[PDB]
Design a protein around this ligand. Structure first.
Ligand SMILES: C[C@H](O)c1cnn(C2CCCC2)c1
Length: 119
């Protein structure tokens, strides 16, 4: 029932994501010199360094907010992909599966702790 435990759990999960080779295209903001029309398709760019910085700055109130930003990394990749003949979207799908598998208990424990706090 520790209401703050999610933060270190998210830091550790981000460390695992950064070691994973599948995170390579998503570790830093998309380079507009490489993808000049990126902002014509994507309204809100997101990447794992921005998520980590937001977490470390104390600018996430809950793991649900962090989840929403990580999911935006994957939705942006899906929206920008021209087709399955894209290694980057395929990497996003595997990385998304890995993230969802690990974030499930973080969200459940946090929501349970908050329900206990407000009992
Ligand atoms: C074409 C490819 O599927 C794709 C999707 N999004 N992107 C961005 C995010 C990662 C670096 C560039 C490339």
């Amino acid at each position: 029932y520790d209401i703050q435990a999610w933060k270190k759990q998210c830091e550790e999960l981000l460390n695992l994501i950064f070691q994973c080779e599948d995170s390579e295209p998503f570790r830093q903001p998309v380079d507009l010199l490489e993808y000049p029309d990126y902002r014509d398709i994507i309204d809100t760019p997101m990447d794992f360094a921005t998520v980590r910085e937001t977490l470390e700055a104390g600018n996430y109130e809950s793991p649900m907010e962090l989840c929403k930003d990580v999911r935006l990394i994957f939705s942006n990749s899906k929206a920008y992909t021209p087709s399955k003949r894209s290694r980057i979207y395929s990497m996003s799908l595997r990385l998304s599966a890995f993230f969802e598998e690990h974030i499930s208990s973080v969200l459940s424990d946090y929501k349970s702790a908050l329900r206990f706090h407000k009992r």
